[PDB]
Amino acid sequence: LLKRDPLNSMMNIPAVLSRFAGKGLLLSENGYLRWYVASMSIGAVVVLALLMVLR
Amino acid sequence: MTITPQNLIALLPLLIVGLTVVVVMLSIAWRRNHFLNATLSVIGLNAALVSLWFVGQAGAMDVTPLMRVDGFAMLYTGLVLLASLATCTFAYPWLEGYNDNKDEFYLLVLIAALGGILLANANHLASLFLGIELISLPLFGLVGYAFRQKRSLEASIKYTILSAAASSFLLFGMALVYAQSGDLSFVALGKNLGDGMLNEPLLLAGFGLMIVGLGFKLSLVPFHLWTPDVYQGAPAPVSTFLATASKIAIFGVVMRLFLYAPVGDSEAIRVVLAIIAFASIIFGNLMALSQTNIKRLLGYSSISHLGYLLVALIALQTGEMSMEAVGVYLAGYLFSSLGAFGVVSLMSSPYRGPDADSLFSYRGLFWHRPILAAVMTVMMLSLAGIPMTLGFIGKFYVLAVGVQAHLWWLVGAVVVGSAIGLYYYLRVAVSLYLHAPPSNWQYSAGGIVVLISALLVLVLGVWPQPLISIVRLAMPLM
Amino acid sequence: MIPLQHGLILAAILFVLGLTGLVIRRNLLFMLIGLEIMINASALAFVVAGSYWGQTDGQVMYILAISLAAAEASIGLALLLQLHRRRQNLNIDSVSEMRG
Amino acid sequence: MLLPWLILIPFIGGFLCWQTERFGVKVPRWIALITMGLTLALSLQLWLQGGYSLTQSAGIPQWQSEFDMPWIPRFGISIHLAIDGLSLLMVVLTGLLGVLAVLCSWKEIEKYQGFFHLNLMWILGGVIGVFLAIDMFLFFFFWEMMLVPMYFLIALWGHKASDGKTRITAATKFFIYTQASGLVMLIAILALVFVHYNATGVWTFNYEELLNTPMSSGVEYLLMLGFFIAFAVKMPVVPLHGWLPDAHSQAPTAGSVDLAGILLKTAAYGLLRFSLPLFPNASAEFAPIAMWLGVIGIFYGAWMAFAQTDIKRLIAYTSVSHMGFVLIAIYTGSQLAYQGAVIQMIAHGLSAAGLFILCGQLYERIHTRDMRMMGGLWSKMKWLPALSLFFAVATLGMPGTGNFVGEFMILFGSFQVVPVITVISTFGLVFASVYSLAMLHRAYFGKAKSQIASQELPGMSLRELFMILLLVVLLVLLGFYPQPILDTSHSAIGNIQQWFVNSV
Numbered sequence A: 001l002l003k004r005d006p007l008n009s010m011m012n013i014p015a016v017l018s019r020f021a022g023k024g025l026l027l028s029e030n031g032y033l034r035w036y037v038a039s040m041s042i043g044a045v046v047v048l049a050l051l052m053v054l055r
Numbered sequence B: 001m002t003i004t005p006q007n008l009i010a011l012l013p014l015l016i017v018g019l020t021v022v023v024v025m026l027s028i029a030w031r032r033n034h035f036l037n038a039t040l041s042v043i044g045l046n047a048a049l050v051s052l053w054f055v056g057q058a059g060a061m062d063v064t065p066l067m068r069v070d071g072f073a074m075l076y077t078g079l080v081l082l083a084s085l086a087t088c089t090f091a092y093p094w095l096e097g098y099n100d101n102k103d104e105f106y107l108l109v110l111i112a113a114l115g116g117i118l119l120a121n122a123n124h125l126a127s128l129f130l131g132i133e134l135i136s137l138p139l140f141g142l143v144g145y146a147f148r149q150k151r152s153l154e155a156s157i158k159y160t161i162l163s164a165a166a167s168s169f170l171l172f173g174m175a176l177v178y179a180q181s182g183d184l185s186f187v188a189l190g191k192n193l194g195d196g197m198l199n200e201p202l203l204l205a206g207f208g209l210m211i212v213g214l215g216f217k218l219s220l221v222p223f224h225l226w227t228p229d230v231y232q233g234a235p236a237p238v239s240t241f242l243a244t245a246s247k248i249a250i251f252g253v254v255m256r257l258f259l260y261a262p263v264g265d266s267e268a269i270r271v272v273l274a275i276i277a278f279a280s281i282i283f284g285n286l287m288a289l290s291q292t293n294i295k296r297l298l299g300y301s302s303i304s305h306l307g308y309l310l311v312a313l314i315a316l317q318t319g320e321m322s323m324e325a326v327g328v329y330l331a332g333y334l335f336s337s338l339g340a341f342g343v344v345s346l347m348s349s350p351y352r353g354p355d356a357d358s359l360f361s362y363r364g365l366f367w368h369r370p371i372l373a374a375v376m377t378v379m380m381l382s383l384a385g386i387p388m389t390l391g392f393i394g395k396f397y398v399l400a401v402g403v404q405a406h407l408w409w410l411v412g413a414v415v416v417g418s419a420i421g422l423y424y425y426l427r428v429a430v431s432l433y434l435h436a437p438p439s440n441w442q443y444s445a446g447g448i449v450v451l452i453s454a455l456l457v458l459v460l461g462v463w464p465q466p467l468i469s470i471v472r473l474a475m476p477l478m
Numbered sequence C: 001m002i003p004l005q006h007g008l009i010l011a012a013i014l015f016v017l018g019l020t021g022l023v024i025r026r027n028l029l030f031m032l033i034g035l036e037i038m039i040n041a042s043a044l045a046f047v048v049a050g051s052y053w054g055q056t057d058g059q060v061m062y063i064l065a066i067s068l069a070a071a072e073a074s075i076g077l078a079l080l081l082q083l084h085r086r087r088q089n090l091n092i093d094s095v096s097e098m099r100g
Numbered sequence D: 001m002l003l004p005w006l007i008l009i010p011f012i013g014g015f016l017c018w019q020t021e022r023f024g025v026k027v028p029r030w031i032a033l034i035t036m037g038l039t040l041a042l043s044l045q046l047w048l049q050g051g052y053s054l055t056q057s058a059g060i061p062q063w064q065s066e067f068d069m070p071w072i073p074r075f076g077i078s079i080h081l082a083i084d085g086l087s088l089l090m091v092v093l094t095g096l097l098g099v100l101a102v103l104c105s106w107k108e109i110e111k112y113q114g115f116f117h118l119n120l121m122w123i124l125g126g127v128i129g130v131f132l133a134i135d136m137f138l139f140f141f142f143w144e145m146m147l148v149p150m151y152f153l154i155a156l157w158g159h160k161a162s163d164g165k166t167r168i169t170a171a172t173k174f175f176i177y178t179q180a181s182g183l184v185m186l187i188a189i190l191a192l193v194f195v196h197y198n199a200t201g202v203w204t205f206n207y208e209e210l211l212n213t214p215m216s217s218g219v220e221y222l223l224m225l226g227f228f229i230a231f232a233v234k235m236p237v238v239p240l241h242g243w244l245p246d247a248h249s250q251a252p253t254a255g256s257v258d259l260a261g262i263l264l265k266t267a268a269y270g271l272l273r274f275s276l277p278l279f280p281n282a283s284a285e286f287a288p289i290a291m292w293l294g295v296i297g298i299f300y301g302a303w304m305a306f307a308q309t310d311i312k313r314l315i316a317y318t319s320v321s322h323m324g325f326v327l328i329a330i331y332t333g334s335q336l337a338y339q340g341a342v343i344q345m346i347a348h349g350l351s352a353a354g355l356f357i358l359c360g361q362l363y364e365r366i367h368t369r370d371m372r373m374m375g376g377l378w379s380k381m382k383w384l385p386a387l388s389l390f391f392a393v394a395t396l397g398m399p400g401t402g403n404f405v406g407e408f409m410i411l412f413g414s415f416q417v418v419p420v421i422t423v424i425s426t427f428g429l430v431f432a433s434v435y436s437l438a439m440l441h442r443a444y445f446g447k448a449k450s451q452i453a454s455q456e457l458p459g460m461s462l463r464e465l466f467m468i469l470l471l472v473v474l475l476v477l478l479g480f481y482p483q484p485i486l487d488t489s490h491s492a493i494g495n496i497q498q499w500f501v502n503s504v
């Protein structure tokens, strides 16, 4: 039962989480200029809303 | 305020770079001479770097309401001038293969360096806006210098559109801040409030729109998506300049704005910048895990390193050595990025078409270019924050600053992002030594520049006290 | 007897209209037009703020803003002409070959 | 005064190993041999001149030799080295294993062995610096600097049979584990320095000054946890162990990388030298968790060693089990258990070095490491199976070898402190005998299970036989006469134990 080293795989879990998160984050880099502008305006909305919430 | 002769002495690198712009442009008007115009540009940049000594002998003073010259301004002027000199040195062997006009490149580099010096000395919203624009527009030209290539043209279009959008965001935020405050000086942004009313909604909204513009300029999440495309599409010396000088100058003026403005210690702005720094570190490290392009990987790396710098920015009012940490980190980051992007530029020189930016092209670099491979693995170790490198000294400064101010979320983010960075930087540095299937003194000068950068990174990684003492000498007006 | 809030609101309305035009238009010329709208709106906001405080600094910032607008419009239209020369098409979605 | 040269002779020797390759391709091995022999001779001279047997416990700090130089005076950071009995034993073991690592890579005459020997000497100098540094920044600096040549040695000079991607993956996993844990330790160091600065007002990274640092319970627990996370990664302590069999399996086939910077127990030394004295109350509350982690390490490593089909992975998991014993010993607060831990560290270094060198020689002979492809190798080789039998007898803790002295003194002191953990650990000794006999029967006894094991094989040469027999003699002498080793470390161990139990 132990010959596959289960604790090693349990500690390898954060590596696969990092791989999955990086692959998900790379979807935002689609190369489209209009999406880059839209993401800038989304970030503007988020920053402004956060500043008004914690004012 | 008027301009005095001692103010003109404090004006010296700006005046010298402007005179170099005029002289190089008149020399181009005389005759197109690549060697002569490149030599005149580097002579002017070296003269400004030397005249920093006379600026230091003059002392710290206010030159007009727009500028304040001190040791901080001198250090950032020196960093900008070093990056510009390296950019010209890498530009010449690349431009030797350029069939169209090559002389305009040095003119654009000089004007961008002028913008960097203005941002180093900026004490005013007008000078901050003008310095950002003076950096950005020559970079619009430089990123699309090889506009016949589709990647360079696409990168130029993306950078121009997004930087115009960010400039309009920053100017609207400046206008809202001015409407609240009634003064565009840095020290007056929040001065007309008291009794715990620093979080005025219009002042905070204006500073948020300025944060949008500046965080575009610093590739901070979520204004970061332009960075790998523009870094990849630009010419490699342009990528060197954009990675070093623009980021360093804009972060220096952000440092000074948050140090001087009474609204800089607002808790809402601090929390928003903490979120941005956390997301920048994590996202920039995570997106570079699976990059087969060295320039895109360096773009995501730049996002993460500016996140670390922003972590040092957050502890500006809490701790005592935030500015010293930022100076040490920026010196180390300048040398590491200069070496890495210079190895990329020398591998892409002379210009023939598409850039040599695939990781398969750098696989087995040691078997034909051993010195360049040694320099590149030193820079990959430095950007990972490995000891006996200056990048580790910068990371140690960032960690000490975060621990002192009890920014535990940011400290944990730095540790996790450092582990992710370890993975991809080691992948590049060890792919350099695997197995895979010039001849003029300007290329040798570029190789000497990257070798000197590697030697400085190693020596100041082992012995960082001279750099620490230099940065501690270069202190702004309290 | 003009409230400063009304001028700032008019400037903000023009700014978000220009940003909307920047996002929703695939043609690069309309993107540049939206950029001109946003920078003109920010310059208007500076003029309103300078007029409220009785200072020349608002009009000075306006002057710097329109200098930026002129130079940026020049560069953007040069890039548009280059895109039309090398593509015969001004669709900004076509310049997307760098991604990931 | 000789401690800077104890660090610098490996570094200058590695530089000379790289530089002398133009004089010939058989030159850098001689330079590395003279370098490590000079380091070992300096360590032995320090042992003779130290007078460690007559040294009494005077309390921390108590150094037989000391060196100080300012390095980064802005933060109060110094090149601060100090030697006492425990660090002296560790440095002597490092020099001996470095000489063995040079001698084991004697036949590698490739075109870039100057860089190989430079990396080996830089690893050994970093290990010596870890054992000598009593400045926390300098200790961390050595702790992290000795992993870069480790990474490059595994990645470029590693197991040639495996694909390059496997070597890159194992090297990267090892580097990420060790460096991320080191960064957590750096966070703990920085927070301790800031607590001391807030309490007093001066900038210091000196371990002697940081000993008297008043802090609340909960802060001290977190600093202890950061230190323990670094040490637990490098010890290894389960579940932070998975890098170790991968790094061993992809290390260079002779095993100089195995000896040079894996089989030197810097983490147990760090727990004894830094974790217990800086955070005695936090370590006292953490003791049950650490002891149960050690118990789990003993049994988990034994079961993993039994389940292996590769010999190198088997020996790596034996290292996991024995370090579980040492981890149990460290948190007892018993002088007898601490002395047993010192003996166990030295004896495990010797026995695992012998096992890894013999495995490298066996792989040179038969070109495979899977035990299912061998068997009956006693009748085919001249010296190797009998020496492997002796070393397997050593790692099960047979009396007459130093391993028995080590873990039995550990168990005596631990039973004086914690009986239940002790009895479970002795059943761990039964498990150790099981895995050692299993490896012996799979490799050397029975009949041949493939074609390579059915033919006569060339015998060991004089150099390999000399180094293996030297390890045999040292292990037997440690088993029958461990008193000079106990007398060397008696004062330092007593100081650490008295500090641990007088502040709790």
Ligand SMILES: CCCCCCCCCCCCCCCCCC(=O)OC[C@H](COP(=O)(O)OCCN)OC(=O)CCCCCCCCCCCCCCCCC
Pocket (backbone or CB within 6 Å): B046, B049, B050, B052, B053, B054, B056, B057, B058, B059, B060, B070, B071, B074, B075, B077, B078, B079, B331, B466, B467, B470, B473, B474, B475
């Ligand atoms: C082929 C041709 C080649 C030509 C040479 C090119 C390479 C060399 C370039 C040399 C540039 C020299 C610049 C010297 C700046 C400092 C001059 C000086 O005297 O500073 C002293 C001053 C404080 O001293 P004091 O004079 O007493 O102050 C009175 C004013 N209140 O100090 C200050 O006020 C602030 C001092 C620090 C300012 C920053 C330092 C200058 C910029 C450095 C950028 C790089 C830093 C990182 C790398 C460091 C490597 C060690």
Ligand SMILES: CCCCCCCCCCCCCCCCCC(=O)OC[C@H](COP(=O)(O)OCCN)OC(=O)CCCCCCCCCCCCCCCCC
Pocket (backbone or CB within 6 Å): A011, A012, A014, A015, A016, A018, A019, B289, B415, B416, B419, B420, B423, D169, D172, D173, D176, D177, D178, D180, D181, D184, D229, D233, D240
């Ligand atoms: C006691 C627990 C708390 C304290 C922990 C202290 C930290 C040190 C000890 C734990 C370290 C755990 C590291 C786990 C990953 C090890 C590295 C690794 O596996 O690298 C190999 C892998 C690439 O190899 P392969 O699987 O072939 O992938 C090819 C994909 N096409 O590489 C990759 O896939 C990329 C790996 C990127 C980096 C890994 C993620 C690091 C995240 C932060 C780690 C810090 C601790 C976080 C909490 C741990 C769990 C509690």
Ligand SMILES: CCCCCCCCCCCCCCCCCC(=O)OC[C@H](COP(=O)(O)OCCN)OC(=O)CCCCCCCCCCCCCCCCC
Pocket (backbone or CB within 6 Å): B406, B408, B411, B412, B413, B415, B416, D184, D187, D188, D191, D195, D198, D214, D215, D216, D219, D222, D223, D225, D226, D229
């Ligand atoms: C992902 C890997 C890395 C892990 C994440 C990064 C580290 C996270 C650390 C979280 C720390 C939470 C602290 C919560 C309390 C803070 C407020 C407080 O109570 O401050 C008290 C004190 C300041 O007041 P003072 O006058 O100094 O009091 C004397 C007490 N000594 O405060 C102090 O004196 C400072 C207390 C500092 C405590 C130690 C912090 C670092 C400890 C080592 C690393 C964390 C533990 C190991 C890793 C866990 C698993 C990953």
Ligand SMILES: CCCCCCCCCCCCCCCCCC(=O)OC[C@H](COP(=O)(O)OCCN)OC(=O)CCCCCCCCCCCCCCCCC
Pocket (backbone or CB within 6 Å): A014, A017, A018, B412, B416, D216, D217, D218, D219, D221, D222, D225, D229, D232, D293
């Ligand atoms: C990409 C995804 C994957 C990668 C990233 C994964 C996540 C990374 C981050 C992991 C770490 C999270 C934070 C852990 C530290 C939390 C600290 C904390 O909560 O401190 C609160 C408190 C502070 O102390 P305080 O009460 O202020 O003291 C003064 C009163 N005398 O503390 C106390 O009072 C004492 C608390 C003691 C225990 C705190 C630490 C728990 C750590 C759990 C794991 C380790 C368990 C032990 C070791 C096991 C073997 C390694």
Ligand SMILES: CCCCCCCCCCCCCCCCCCCC
Pocket (backbone or CB within 6 Å): D089, D092, D093, D346, D474, D475, D477, D478, D481, D482, D483, D484, D485
């Ligand atoms: C660090 C490596 C240690 C290896 C094991 C060494 C064990 C000690 C051996 C000492 C010598 C024993 C035989 C000679 C005894 C001489 C007694 C002299 C006084 C009567």
Ligand SMILES: CCCCCCCCCCCCCC
Pocket (backbone or CB within 6 Å): B408, B409, B411, B412, B413, B416
């Ligand atoms: C991905 C990085 C995770 C880092 C986690 C850090 C947690 C810090 C918690 C601090 C709690 C303080 C309570 C007073």
